[PDB]
Design a protein around this ligand. Structure first.
Ligand SMILES: *[C@@H]1O[C@H](CO)[C@@H](O[C@@H]2O[C@H](CO)[C@@H](O[C@@H]3O[C@H](CO)[C@@H](O)[C@H](O)[C@@H]3O)[C@H](O)[C@H]2NC(C)=O)[C@H](O)[C@H]1NC(C)=O
Ligand SMILES: *[C@@H]1O[C@H](CO)[C@@H](O[C@@H]2O[C@H](CO)[C@@H](O)[C@H](O)[C@H]2NC(C)=O)[C@H](O)[C@H]1NC(C)=O
Ligand code: NAG
Ligand code: NAG
Ligand code: NAG
Ligand code: NAG
Ligand code: NAG
Ligand code: NAG
Lengths: 150, 311
């Protein structure tokens, strides 16, 4: 699974589990450093950079859903995040980029080399790389659309 | 549904049975009911004025009564019976316990609620042993009563919401014993043995009850800062400052309870420390971080039981 979000937006990284007995979920990153998890109805938060921005809908814990919510994204918040309950573990890759402004620039995570492509309402494709109506950046299957003004 | 006798006590001797049974501290209807019942006792012992749930605000009659009757005992419902793993090698999970015994009712269970440490437990013996989850590395650690471990907290007496707690006892060597018995437990798991095995607090950005050590004294919820107690026993004091709160987060359900302001007098409690609640992250180095899982207290108290049906 991959999710991609716009810098300064929130994303809800989903994680779900089918156990009737009461369990402890964990979220961590590629480095195996913990961002958050539960202990009963309490929320526990590891020493990661995310904290402040990292949270979960606790009201959904009782029925299996253990989401990781990051608010106000930052390019370096891009990572492969892992939700573990016990022995199972879902992964979710997050990749976040925004558009500065016209020479347009696309700051992305290091590792990802994306391409922005902008198309006007009746005028057509201006496709590039990092530097350059609706601007779409491409990575994996989907992209994320943007904006322009005259 | 197990009948929950109050207080009984201790005329409930047991008998050896020539059988093999599977035991589990977590997947277990005795401990699963214990947790619910303790949660129910939690809301009646210290009475909340308001309860905030996402959707609603529940206001009820509160005051400053405090039920100190913290011990109870289960007995089997009709057509069922209690078995127990009387093997000393039990570590909260065993599919082939051959030392099975049977009783009419369970041992005494301590109903107190706390994080990091369990207090006034039954199940204190002359050994440190470790209940360890079947799946997962959730654990509750019994401490050895050889080392005369207590906690002793007071609020004078001056400032209405401040308090200290002294950790009396041979903690120096009780704590290295738990480190050492983890090192030769059937899940070491990646470990060097001592020195490069350490106790760790959860993040401060965690809930108050996780970040601080939650407990109560004379019906007042204290929250203490454990950094001095952690500096002592790793690297600096055998006491800690704790501060009282009225808004607290509920351990079992998602919500907040608001309580009345503290008592006027000198508060003081004498408590025997009997368990560490923790999670073991084994390093191939390892860290044992303290937990606020709470329900696991009751899994130490009754996790060696099993309710079987007689058809
Ligand atoms: C662990 O066990 C001890 C012993 O039962 C608990 O402390 C005892 O419990 C309450 C307060 O927590 C005290 O009872 C009250 O005493 C005052 C007079 O000081 C009186 O006004 C009340 O009517 C009531 O009798 C009791 O003094 C206290 N005793 C000792 C020796 O500490 C303790 O609270 C337990 N710890 C936990 C964390 O549950
Ligand atoms: C319990 O902790 C251990 C750590 O000792 C974990 O089990 C494996 O540990 C080795 C190295 O010690 C790693 O290479 C494996 O990846 C770990 N296995 C996993 C994550 O399944 C393990 O994290 C914990 N046990 C469970 C059931 O989660
Ligand atoms: C308005 C709102 O958030 N309501 C939810 C409700 O849908 C859910 O059933 C309950 C228990 O999970 O938590 C609360
Ligand atoms: C339970 O085991 C202990 C020691 O392991 C023993 O002393 C005791 O007599 C046993 N009781 C029964 C009923 O088997
Ligand atoms: C839970 O315990 C019961 C009885 O010991 C058993 O039938 C079941 O397989 C156990 N595990 C789960 C996951 O339900
Ligand atoms: C009691 O505990 C201590 C500390 O672990 C141990 O050294 C001693 O041998 C034990 N004594 C008995 C009688 O079991
Ligand atoms: C154990 O600690 C308690 C509480 O401080 C104390 O009263 C007692 O004298 C200590 N020693 C023994 C042997 O019980
Ligand atoms: C405990 O005190 C330390 C030492 O200054 C402090 O850094 C920390 O914020 C306190 N703990 C918590 C959970 O706030």
């Amino acid at each position: 699974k991959v999710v991609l979000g716009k810098k300064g937006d929130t994303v809800e990284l989903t994680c779900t589990a089918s156990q009737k007995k009461s369990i402890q979920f964990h979220w961590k990153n590629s480095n195996q450093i913990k961002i958050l998890g539960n202990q009963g109805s309490f929320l526990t938060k590891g020493p990661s950079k995310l904290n402040d921005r990292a949270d979960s809908r606790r009201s959904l814990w009782d029925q299996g859903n253990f989401p990781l919510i990051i608010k106000n994204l930052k390019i370096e918040d891009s990572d492969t995040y892992i939700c573990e309950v016990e022995d199972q573990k879902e992964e979710v890759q997050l990749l976040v980029f925004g558009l500065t402004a016209l020479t347009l620039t696309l700051e992305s995570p290091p590792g990802s080399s994306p391409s922005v492509q902008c198309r006007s309402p009746r005028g057509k494709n201006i496709q590039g790389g990092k530097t350059l109506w609706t601007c779409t950046v491409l990575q994996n299957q989907k992209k994320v659309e943007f904006k322009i003004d005259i | 549904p197990l009948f929950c006798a109050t207080k009984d006590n201790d005329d409930y001797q047991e008998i050896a049975l020539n059988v093999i049974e599977a035991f589990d501290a977590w997947n277990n209807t005795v401990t699963e009911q214990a947790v619910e019942d303790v949660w129910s006792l939690f809301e009646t012992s210290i009475k909340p004025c308001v309860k905030l749930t996402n959707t609603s605000v529940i206001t009820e009659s509160c005051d400053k009564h405090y039920w100190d009757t913290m011990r109870f005992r289960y007995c089997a419902p009709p057509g069922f019976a209690l078995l127990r793993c009387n093997d000393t090698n039990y570590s909260g999970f065993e599919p082939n316990c051959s030392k099975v015994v049977a009783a009419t009712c369970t041992r005494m269970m301590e109903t107190q609620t706390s994080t990091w440490f369990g207090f006034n437990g039954t199940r204190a013996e002359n050994r440190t042993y470790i209940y360890w989850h079947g799946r997962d590395n959730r654990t509750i650690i019994s401490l050895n009563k050889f080392y005369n471990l207590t906690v002793h907290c007071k609020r004078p007496g001056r400032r209405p919401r401040q308090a200290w707690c002294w950790f009396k006892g041979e903690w120096k060597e009780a704590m290295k014993e738990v480190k050492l018995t983890l090192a030769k437990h059937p899940r070491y798991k990646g470990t060097n043995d001592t020195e490069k095995i350490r106790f760790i607090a959860p993040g401060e950005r965690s809930d108050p009850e996780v970040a601080y050590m939650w407990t109560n004294c004379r019906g007042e919820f204290l929250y203490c800062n454990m950094t001095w107690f952690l500096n002592w026993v790793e690297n600096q004091h055998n006491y800690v400052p704790c501060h009282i709160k009225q808004i607290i987060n509920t351990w079992h359900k998602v919500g907040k309870n608001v309580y009345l302001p503290p008592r006027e007098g000198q508060l003081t409690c004498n408590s025997t420390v009997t368990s560490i609640i923790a999670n073991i992250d084994g390093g191939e180095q390892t860290n044992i971080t303290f937990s606020a899982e709470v329900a696991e207290l009751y899994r130490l108290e009754l996790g060696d039981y099993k309710l079987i049906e007689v058809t």
